[PDB]
């Protein structure tokens, strides 16, 4: 004569705990993880053009350290610097190394165009046993070591116009002898100087004589500088000694290129997101793998887990 109709909802034997506004842990039927916390341990060669530096830093590949000759004219989306990288050429320093490395990494190309510089009155192509190329002495491939021709080192004054529609990056340097004897032996002048300028910029460098610690048999050094010449501008190099001349320019580009420090293997696969730990999927909005990323990546958070409830409050049955 009567009936009973009860309304209800489902429950699962084991739900998941989630945080809420009023609760640190409350059980729900289902939840989903929002923080990516694991990596494959390998870097996928797809879809970004990955360039393994192997035992070359981007700077050594740029200068032309003999063992980095293989990177001549390379391009990349992500240049990967290995910790095993080392230098094996003339001992040098780059005042403001981070900026040079940054702007080159960002440009994304090592394309070098040789230009016909004329260095009149000097002997070119100097080399060192600290930078052997094959059997004998060599030097960085993109630089030209000029020494005195006989009894005088003249006041070099050359120009190279940027008649193109793009920016030219010129890398050049100055030689710091370890003694005055070396200074006069190579450059005659007791004190050299290099002035590199465009119509808007100008840089004058004076060599610093002195003994530095021995590196590859040498106590002298080379300091690297750079000059970007915009279309229509002109490059002028003036010097009466110590000039480590450029052989041409690197083409500059703007794009998505960068550089990363990582010893992770490069594997054949596809992944939008790269961290030094290896690639990681980007299906989740956050990640806790590494704050250093490249590509379409989840945002870095300090948490290793953040569950989003995708079900109702779990209230299991009575029991009998």
């Amino acid at each position: 004569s009567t009936a009973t109709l009860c309304l209800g909802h489902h429950a699962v034997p084991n739900g998941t705990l989630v945080k809420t506004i009023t609760d640190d842990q409350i059980e729900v039927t289902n939840a989903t993880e929002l923080v990516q916390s694991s990596s494959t341990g390998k870097i996928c060669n797809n879809p970004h053009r990955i360039l393994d530096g192997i035992d070359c830093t981007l700077i050594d590949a740029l200068l032309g350290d003999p063992h980095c000759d293989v990177f001549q004219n390379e391009t990349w989306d992500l240049f990967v610097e290995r910790s095993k990288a080392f230098s094996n050429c003339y001992p040098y320093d780059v005042p403001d190394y981070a900026s040079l490395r940054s702007l080159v990494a960002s440009s994304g190309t090592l394309e070098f165009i040789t230009e016909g510089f004329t260095w009149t009155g000097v002997i070119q192509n100097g080399g060192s046993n600290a930078c052997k190329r094959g059997p004998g002495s060599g030097f960085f491939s993109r630089l030209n070591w000029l020494t005195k021709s006989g009894s005088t080192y003249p006041v070099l004054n050359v120009t190279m116009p940027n008649n193109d529609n793009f920016d030219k990056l010129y890398i050049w340097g100055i030689h710091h002898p370890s003694t005055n004897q070396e200074q006069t032996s190579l450059y005659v002048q007791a004190s050299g100087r290099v002035t590199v300028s465009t119509r808007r910029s100008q840089q004058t460098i004076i060599p610093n004589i002195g003994s530095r610690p021995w590196v590859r048999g040498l106590s002298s050094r080379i300091s690297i500088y750079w000059t970007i010449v915009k279309p229509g501008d002109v490059l002028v190099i003036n010097s009466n000694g110590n000039l480590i001349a450029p052989r041409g320019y690197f083409k500059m580009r703007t794009g998505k290129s960068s550089i990363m420090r990582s010893d992770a293997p490069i594997d054949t696969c596809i992944s939008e997101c790269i961290t030094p730990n290896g690639s990681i999927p980007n299906d989740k909005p956050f990640q806790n793998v590494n704050k250093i990323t490249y590509g379409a990546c989840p945002k870095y958070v300090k948490q290793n887990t953040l569950k989003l409830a995708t079900g109702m409050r779990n209230v299991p049955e009575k029991q009998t």
Binding site: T2, A3, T4, L7, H9, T20, G255, G295, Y300, V315
Partner: protein
């Protein structure tokens, strides 16, 4: 939750109900049974899906940024570089935490709401033919076999057809 249905007037859930999230269990002249309500299930599911799609949407691409690990001590510029990233990480970590908390609170209230809306909808169909027991169940004061039960479930229940039997049973029998 805000409505007090789930984990409220409804004692506990039903394990094993796989056909839906919300449903009915009945006891009538012909016996007992359980059935999922698909409309309310779908409503809760669509809201949770909509919520999930906004959250797991569009990771933004960053390419060349700033350095975040240093091998040498430098001072001023490096302190700034580190402070900037730490500041950024703290703010996003805060965003992630708050987001999850809000969302979860909302998910629980929303599902509790759908349980309640189904209950209310059912109450309104029954009119004066049933009384509420206070536990998510209704006492239907008239013979209601399986077809009758299914008509309540499918929303085609006509209270008029049973009004007089129900009223006599409700407001009488003893007085």
């Amino acid at each position: 939750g805000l409505f007090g249905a789930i984990a409220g007037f409804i004692e506990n859930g039903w394990e094993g109900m796989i056909d839906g999230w919300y449903g009915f269990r009945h006891q009538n002249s012909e016996g007992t049974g359980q059935a999922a309500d698909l409309k309310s299930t779908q409503a809760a599911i669509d809201q949770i899906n909509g919520k999930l799609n906004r959250v797991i949407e569009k990771t933004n691409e960053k390419f060349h940024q700033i350095e975040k690990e240093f091998s040498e001590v430098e001072g001023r510029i490096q302190d700034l570089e580190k402070y900037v990233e730490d500041t950024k990480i703290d703010l996003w970590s805060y965003n992630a935490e708050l987001l999850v908390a809000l969302e979860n609170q909302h998910t629980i209230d929303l599902t509790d709401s759908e349980m309640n809306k189904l209950f209310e909808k059912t109450r309104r169909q029954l009119r004066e033919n049933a009384e509420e027991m206070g536990n998510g169940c209704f006492k239907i004061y008239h013979k209601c076999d399986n077809a009758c039960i299914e008509s309540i479930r499918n929303g085609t229940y006509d209270h008029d057809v049973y009004r007089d039997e129900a009223l006599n049973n409700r407001f009488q029998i003893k007085g």
